Each structure stands twice: as structure tokens, then as C-alpha cells.
């Protein structure tokens, strides 16, 4: 396995920051070496290749450097657009090979925000056609990561995020509670608690 | 103006045969290699393999090599990532990628726009709404729905400020759900069922 490992696997920064990725190779490869840009939903995008070498129409604030085995990606001013996640690469040209870095992804630096906590119970609709889905809401916090604690007076629950809030560097959680109408109705009150370094102690609701 | 550009969304069952493309403009295809990347939702890129357009030369990443069949056809500057027998574990980002230089295996500088695979054994299938009933939040949730996507605005694009619409999950059943939050209602589009909810 020629592997290549990005540090770190996220980096929370402010527009204005030099920041540094780094990317280390398992095997000494010189400077073949690339670096690529990905935002949300596009494609990726070349910024540096033979380890130090800017693709025309990147930006100067971008630089690369390093040989054999240890390699890095340099902002030296962080702007609104340098918030994606960026790859490295091993590639040769003599032999084919291309090798990327599991990423890293560079997202906006914010104070600490608790998350406002909602829940909702089943819909009189749903409850009629088979299933109960109780959805818990943790609204508006940083930083991205939040415990999820489902309490019925496991592996029957589902999550997903937001992604960052642009103009106010947050993110959102929703929980799916998936059971059936009776796990459902034997139960009566219901319960969300949520773990987040925003909050002295976890809250529920 | 140099560009690859990719054929459109795949949404298949397994078993099925698949074959997308990529087509270059604006310089001699035959002169460069096409590179194919994957990227699985929620995950970084992986190289496929890399084909010589000139001559069809060939070559895969060790894991994928028998589990893909990379093709070209030189004469309409179009390269092929083709699948006899897709899995469910197929589904996925394709990209299609260029060297910056001719016969070399450099970086990749041009990229298509990449072709979303949905490899599933579910069939098409609309979403039920539900609301989520109560400053103050409420929402939709938007369940049990094939394929993605489908598209939630409030009050018919009035009302946007407060509005978190979630990626969707997907649920064991191979049915997706998702949430919309900011009973009063909700306007949910799914195109794949023509099925179009306002709640």
C-alpha cells in the first residue's frame, strides 16, 4: 500500500489565517506530488502539482512544499473561497499510479454556540400507515460535533447535518427515531438529550 | 475552452449493465490520457484507472481492475467507464479527469463535471409528508421516498429565513428520508414519481 495521510482530518479557521495541511507519504516519492480544491457538490480542482508548482489561475496565497515523505499545503491568507476540503495525490507518469490522501476538510473558525434543542412526536398521518418517526432538532451550533441520546421511557435511529451555515458558521442536526406503532404505543413520554461542549451538561427535551 | 463533459445521473438496479461517458472538447483527445475517479457519498476520491485514447492502453487500480471496463472511442474524443454488472456498493460520483500535459501521467487539471450513480434494488417511489407540529420550530419530514432527489420549499419560496432542509438519509428499506424544518405548509417536489406535495 503506497498511502498517503492527511493531517489534520479537519481544521477550523478564520478568513485572514495562514493555515497549513499536511499530507504524509508511507514511501519516499520526490515530488510527485498534487494537491487538489473540492467544494460541496462540485467537481475537484488542481491548485499545486510537483509538490510546490501553482496551476495557472490559482490564487498566490496557495503554496506547496516538501519532498520524500512529508509534504504541505499553505494558505497564507485564508479567504471566504479556501473553505473546502482539499486532497493530496502520488501520481508518477512512468507507471500508472495515482494515490489520493483520505482529505481534509477547512471549515470556518466560530465561538462556541449551543444548540437550540426541538423535538416533534409522530404525525396522526404516520401514525395510521405503520410507523412512528419522532424527530429530534439540535438548531444552530458549533462546533460540529453533537451526541445524539434517544430515550424510550441502539440502532433504530438516523442522523445527518447541515452543512455550514455561511453567514453564520453553524450547523444544524436531525435525528430520525424509527420504530413501529407499538414499540410506539406501549411507550408514553418521550425523550431527546443531547451532549454538545456548548452546554454544561447534556440538555433534554 | 477545454472541457470534459459527462453524460447525465444514473439511477440502475443491480445486476444491471451501465456504461457513461466522457467527452473532450477543445483540445486533441488523443494526445492526453482519461483518468476515471470515484467518489462514494460522503467519502474522498479514489483513481479508477486511466486510459491512452490513441490506443485504448489501459490500466487499472489493482482494486478495480476486473470489476470495471474503461473504453474509448478516439474518433469522438469520448471516453467510457462501463459497468456489465453494477452493484449496490456501485453507487457513487464518477469523474472523469485530464493530465495537465500530453502523454504523461501528471496531475489531473481538467475534470468533468461528474456523473452521480444510484445503484438500487428499490423502485421509483413518491414520499410521504408528515408535519412536524410545534421562537419557535416546525417542519416536514419527507419519508420513504426513491430515487433522490426531491426538492422542499416553504410557502411556495416566500418563506426561506430560518429554513434547514436536510440531506437525505437512507433507511434500510433502500427508501430515502429527509426533514425540513424553520400542519402550515410545505411545498415537497419528487420528479422521479412526478409526485408533488404541498402540506
Known amino acids: 500500500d503506497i498511502q498517503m495521510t492527511q493531517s489534520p482530518s479537519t481544521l477550523s479557521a478564520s478568513v485572514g489565517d495562514r493555515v497549513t495541511i499536511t499530507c504524509r507519504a508511507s514511501?519516499?516519492?520526490?515530488?510527485?506530488l498534487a494537491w487538489y480544491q473540492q467544494r460541496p457538490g462540485k467537481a475537484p480542482k488542481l491548485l499545486i502539482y510537483?509538490?510546490?508548482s501553482l496551476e495557472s489561475g490559482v490564487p498566490s496565497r496557495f503554496s506547496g512544499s516538501g519532498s520524500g515523505t512529508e509534504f504541505t499545503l499553505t494558505i497564507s491568507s485564508l479567504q471566504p473561497d479556501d473553505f473546502a476540503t482539499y486532497y493530496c495525490?502520488?501520481?508518477?507518469?512512468?507507471?500508472?499510479?495515482?494515490?489520493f490522501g483520505q482529505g481534509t476538510k477547512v471549515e470556518i473558525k466560530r465561538t462556541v454556540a449551543a444548540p437550540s434543542v426541538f423535538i416533534f412526536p409522530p404525525s396522526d398521518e404516520q401514525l395510521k400507515s405503520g410507523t412512528a418517526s419522532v424527530v429530534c432538532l439540535l438548531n444552530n451550533f458549533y462546533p460540529r460535533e453533537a451526541k445524539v441520546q434517544w430515550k424510550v421511557d441502539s440502532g433504530n435511529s438516523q442522523e445527518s447535518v447541515t452543512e455550514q451555515d455561511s453567514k453564520d458558521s453553524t450547523y444544524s442536526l436531525s435525528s430520525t427515531l424509527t420504530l413501529s406503532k407499538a414499540d410506539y404505543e406501549k411507550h408514553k413520554v418521550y425523550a431527546c438529550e443531547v451532549t454538545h461542549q456548548g452546554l454544561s451538561s447534556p440538555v433534554t427535551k | 475552452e477545454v472541457q470534459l463533459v459527462q453524460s447525465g445521473a444514473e439511477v440502475k438496479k443491480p445486476g444491471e449493465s451501465l456504461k457513461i461517458s466522457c467527452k473532450g472538447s477543445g483540445y486533441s483527445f488523443t494526445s492526453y490520457w482519461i483518468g476515471w475517479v470515484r467518489q462514494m457519498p460522503g467519502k474522498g476520491l479514489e483513481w479508477m484507472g486511466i486510459i491512452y485514447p490513441g490506443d485504448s492502453d489501459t490500466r487499472y487500480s489493482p482494486s478495480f481492475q476486473g470489476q470495471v471496463t474503461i473504453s474509448a472511442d478516439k474518433s469522438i474524443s469520448t471516453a467510457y467507464l462501463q459497468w456489465s454488472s453494477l452493484k449496490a456498493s456501485d453507487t457513487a460520483m464518477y469523474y472523469c479527469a485530464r493530465p495537465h500535459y500530453y502523454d504523461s501521467l501528471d496531475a489531473f487539471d481538467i475534470w468533468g463535471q461528474g456523473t452521480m450513480v444510484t445503484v438500487s434494488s428499490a423502485s421509483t417511489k413518491g414520499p410521504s409528508v408528515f408535519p412536524l407540529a410545534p421562537t419557535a420550530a416546525l417542519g416536514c419530514l419527507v419519508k420513504d421516498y426513491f430515487p433522490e432527489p426531491v426538492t422542499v420549499s416553504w410557502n411556495s419560496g416566500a418563506l426561506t429565513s430560518g429554513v434547514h432542509t436536510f440531506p437525505a438519509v437512507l433507511q434500510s428499506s433502500g427508501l430515502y428520508s429527509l426533514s425540513s424544518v424553520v400542519t402550515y405548509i410545505c411545498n415537497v417536489n419528487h420528479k422521479p414519481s412526478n409526485t408533488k406535495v404541498d402540506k
Open positions: 510537483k509538490a510546490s
Open positions: 495525490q502520488h501520481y508518477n507518469s512512468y507507471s500508472p499510479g495515482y494515490t
Open positions: 514511501q519516499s516519492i520526490s515530488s510527485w
